[PDB]
Design a protein around this ligand. Structure first.
Ligand SMILES: *[C@@H](O)[C@H](C[C@@H]1CCNC1=O)NC(=O)[C@H](CC(C)C)NC(=O)OCCSc1ccccc1
Lengths: 299, 301
């Protein structure tokens, strides 16, 4: 009765196009009369190692950009670069443009990813922005320009554009202004991330979800102060819990009658002992990519 | 592990969702060409639901009793019929967003995307696996019936599931788009029991192939087995027996890795009989059974 759920992707599918420079093809986002895509589309082989993007860009003309919306080519009539994103002005407005905004998400927030190849949507799944500003996605060659988003009412909030895969197999990208999340650079180099930590407010949300669906073997009669919980959390590379996090979990504490700090005491015990080979909502590991909102919406 | 439960993009299905109301009962329907498909229990009074007389309830109905809306725009109903547990409402407008589509009946172990909808409005999309006992582990609230499950092959939407009910154990049951239930369930507000569930062997094998493709291959042994010997062992561990179709849908992964299906079965047999002994596969001591062979090839390649 509790599932990792992506937003319906139709409003975003109608914006995906294919963008090609030379031998490099990736995806773009077509909103009104502008197509947004990762700037490294303008790179060749030799370029990707250490590209001077302003240099590469000035040597380009509008006609070197091949933009295809399905079996239809769009004419590029202007281009500009904003940080690591290229903006291609085309002569046709996308009639399928939804109401939208560009947002920069905070670590610990979640969003849906519409993975695309050759301008064609291929799959949708939920991701969290990690505390170390990576995301644990599923992206292959040609996925760059795939976007992450949330939907509030009629409005699509774009928060992520995909650019790279790190050697550990996690992923890195930018907001739609082209600024990376995290200390990464769009060059073909092996980059390591900062130490990742676990999103504690999300683990607590998920534990509450497991209680709602009747799995409460992990609960206990003990309790803890906020600070004492945070000392243990930090020891185990969990993010500290703020009073705003406690407030945000209110609805779930109300719903289940379990005080936030009582659930913290359960989590502390799990951190110190393990799951004894047991499972919670099917998982052998503590899940930290469900926000309190994600849980509430769905229960 | 490197693997995500990934749904299909839902847009082609979003363009087909409507709502269908009888009296105060509203659920979701599927609008393809000039027909709307929905669960027949929309015609139930909350008091008719203990053991509804669907044929009698339908006889009293006329086209003008059904309120079909795409958003808030009414779609006029011009004909109605019942096919097993689904109602078919002929409407006077062909859906301009109708995709290329088919109606397919899936087998246990197969996965599909669910577009969870309320009042004809999509709320979320997620991947489900049909369990061997013909339940799915969904996330459905009141008003979700008529939500559909589907796969997309190139441009074509294969609709395989329509949602009708929840079981006491928290799992979910429903029909294909011809209204035939998966499993032994019926659309009555009664407590019904799923058979004990079992592990989807073919998908575990796909998972082991996935592990091999990614270089995690400690569990490969030097032996093989017959299919019958493997199946008799597997049942003692509450694993499903393999069918010939299971062996065939493992073909591509077998060819990609050069590991014969029956050799992988012998490796799985040893894992069942000996446990993992503290080891992991794809970063987990638990074997995953909700990725099909198609799903593995989707994400790896
Ligand atoms: C999209 O163009 C593509 C998406 C990745 C391909 C594999 N999975 C992906 O997420 N992006 C890239 O290939 C990156 C292009 C750069 C930004 C110009 N490059 C990238 O991710 O390279 C791999 C980094 S790890 C590495 C690099 C060098 C040597 C060893 C390891």
């Amino acid at each position: 009765g509790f599932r990792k759920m992506a937003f319906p992707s139709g409003k975003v599918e109608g914006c995906m196009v294919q963008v090609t420079c030379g031998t490099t093809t990736l995806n773009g986002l077509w909103l009104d009369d502008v197509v947004y895509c990762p700037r490294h589309v303008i790179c060749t082989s030799e370029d990707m190692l250490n590209p001077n993007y302003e240099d590469l860009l000035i040597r380009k003309s509008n006609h070197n950009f091949l933009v295809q919306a399905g079996n239809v080519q769009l004419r590029v009539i202007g281009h500009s670069m904003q940080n690591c994103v290229l903006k291609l002005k085309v002569d046709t407005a996308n009639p399928k443009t939804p109401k939208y905004k560009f947002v920069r998400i905070q670590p610990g927030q979640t969003f849906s990813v519409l993975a695309c190849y050759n301008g064609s949507p291929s799959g949708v799944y939920q991701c969290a922005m990690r505390p170390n500003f990576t995301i644990k996605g599923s992206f292959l060659n040609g996925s760059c320009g795939s976007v992450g988003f949330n939907i509030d009412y009629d409005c699509v909030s774009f928060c992520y554009m995909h650019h790279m895969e790190l050697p550990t197999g996690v992923h890195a990208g930018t907001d739609l202004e082209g600024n990376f999340y995290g200390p990464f650079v769009d060059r073909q180099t092996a980059q390591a991330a900062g130490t990742d930590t676990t999103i504690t407010v999300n683990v607590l949300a998920w534990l509450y979800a497991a209680v709602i669906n009747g799995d409460r073997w992990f609960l206990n009669r003990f309790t803890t102060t906020l600070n004492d919980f945070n000392l243990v959390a930090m020891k185990y590379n969990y993010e500290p819990l703020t009073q705003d996090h406690v407030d945000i979990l209110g609805p779930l504490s109300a719903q289940t009658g379990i005080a936030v700090l009582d659930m913290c005491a359960s989590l502390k015990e799990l951190l110190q002992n393990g799951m004894n080979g047991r499972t919670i909502l099917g998982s052998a590991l503590l899940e930290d990519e469900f926000t309190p909102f994600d849980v509430v919406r769905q229960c």
